[PDB]
A paper describes a structure:
Here we present two crystal structures of LaIHA, one bound to the hydrolytic product isatinate, and one bound to benzyl benzoate, as well as the apo structure of homologous RsIHA. Together with results from enzyme kinetic analysis, the resolved structures are used to describe the molecular basis for the Mn2+-dependent mechanism of hydrolysis, showing that IHA is a true orthologue of IHB. The highly conserved Mn2+ binding site is located at the bottom of the substrate-binding pocket.
The structures of LaIHA:benzyl benzoate and LaIHA:isatinate were determined at 1.50 Å and 1.79 Å resolution, respectively, while the one of RsIHA was determined at 2.65 Å resolution. The more distant homolog from Ralstonia solanacearum (RsIHA) shares 59% SI with LaIHA and 51% SI with LaIHB. Unlike the whole sequence, the active site and substrate binding pocket are highly conserved among these proteins. Even though the key substrate binding pocket residues originally identified in the structure of LaIHB - Phe63, Trp65 and Trp84 and Phe20917 do not share equivalent positions in the sequences of LaIHA or RsIHA, their aromatic side chains do adopt an identical structural conformation in the respective binding pockets, thus indicating functional conservation. Compared to LaIHB, the Mn2+ binding sites in both RsIHA and LaIHA include Gln219, also responsible for increased metal specificity. Structural superposition revealed identical metal binding sites in the two homologues.
Author numbering:
A (entry chain A): -1 to 263
B (entry chain B): 4 to 263
The structure:
Amino acid sequence: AMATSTTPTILPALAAGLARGNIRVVDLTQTLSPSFPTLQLPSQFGQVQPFKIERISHYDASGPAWYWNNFSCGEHTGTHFDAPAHWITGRDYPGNSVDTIAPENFVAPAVVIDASAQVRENEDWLLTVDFLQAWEQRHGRIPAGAWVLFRTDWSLRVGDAAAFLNIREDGAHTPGPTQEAVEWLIGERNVHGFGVETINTDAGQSYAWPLAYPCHTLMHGANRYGLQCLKNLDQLPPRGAFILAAPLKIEGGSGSPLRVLALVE
Amino acid sequence: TTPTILPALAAGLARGNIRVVDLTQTLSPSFPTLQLPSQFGQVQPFKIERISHYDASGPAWYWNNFSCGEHTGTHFDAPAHWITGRDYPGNSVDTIAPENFVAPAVVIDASAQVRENEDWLLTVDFLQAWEQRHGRIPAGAWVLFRTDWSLRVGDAAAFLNIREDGAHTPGPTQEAVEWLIGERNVHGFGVETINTDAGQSYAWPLAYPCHTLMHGANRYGLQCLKNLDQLPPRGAFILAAPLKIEGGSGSPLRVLALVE
Ligand SMILES: [Mn+2]
Ligand SMILES: [Mn+2]
């Protein structure tokens, strides 16, 4: 529902659409809580803090008319955003941290790739170029400047931290893209970024590939972005959704937790 | 079926017809921290520590840990934050209907007045005069109070502006708050200061009318905004989604504004 000029303004129409219910708002964010799975690296590396929250007052002696908390966590805690500075191949880009990235990049279209049935039968399942090209045969070309949201239904494991991280003696076993798929998405489709439901955009076992963690290496290496621990991807269409993903303005931040929202029309 | 608005929005952003404005202050240890009388619980200042920096602690990556409060820097005030809004359903940042995280805004410029009086008060007459000039304030819209107070951010003492008789920062009167809520049905109130209420309103017989009445009416607040000088009087669209902190009374957030 828009105006009657050849090239009108969109924001009035947008506001009215959201109010009417023509455009819905979907929450793709997990809840920040002390029970949320915390990533653990081998002991030789520095570790991220888990989410901790402590009450300051609760309408009581400490604060008779108000209630509020202090909290602590890591940049890469829960539903969060990966800036290019996070990886060594993206260290030297000008606007590569969450406080310097051009604000325009915090809003973008998205496509959703559903592989939940495949991951249900293989926790190490790999997203391939062949699979992506078959997707386009059904839903059309992946548009340049769009998020690629990898739906795996992995978010349903959030109640079980052991199941969510899914770690064995040889590391984490989680699904992810092949190097060729990452190269194709960047070079042939010029995507905005890569979004997952897991605690890693890369496949867990890709630490041992010739080029370790290809998604982190190549996406950040090409000044692109990442999203992690997304949920409710099953409520999104294959294409047409619009993502609101603005990270905290942390000085020199390599990433931050954020409230990821999807607009659906 | 066939969408019409969202493709136009994406296209407009890509072509440059629609601009994105960052209304957010940078989170850093040097940013002014809210301070209360010593008998009350205090909010933690923003601190940050490196985990690794492409070194032995993490050969190919860089990342930090950090700690702060829900009410640090540019942040979002939820109705559960105040005792009058504690009983509303969906009153915390994890339970508020997500539809409330996007809303239009009006921008009321009082920079000229505040520059001559640090304790300047937003009154009903000023708002009604504003409407005669820029139209009626629409229901469900943010009321963004421009004071250019954000320019004081480099000086913590000047930003908080506390003297022996409390803080001296601009804000609305009780009548103004009641009017905006009861007669216009606004979405919430947003300011460039660390307080949506006037600093001296702590001593008013009805202390902190904005916090008390706005949250008491299941409405919201934004603190420590900036770049309000780049927004039109009306027509701006605000993106303000708070962190999904479990039972959170608020959170820091990235506040954006779409302008065309
Ligand atoms: Mn991350
Ligand atoms: Mn606050």
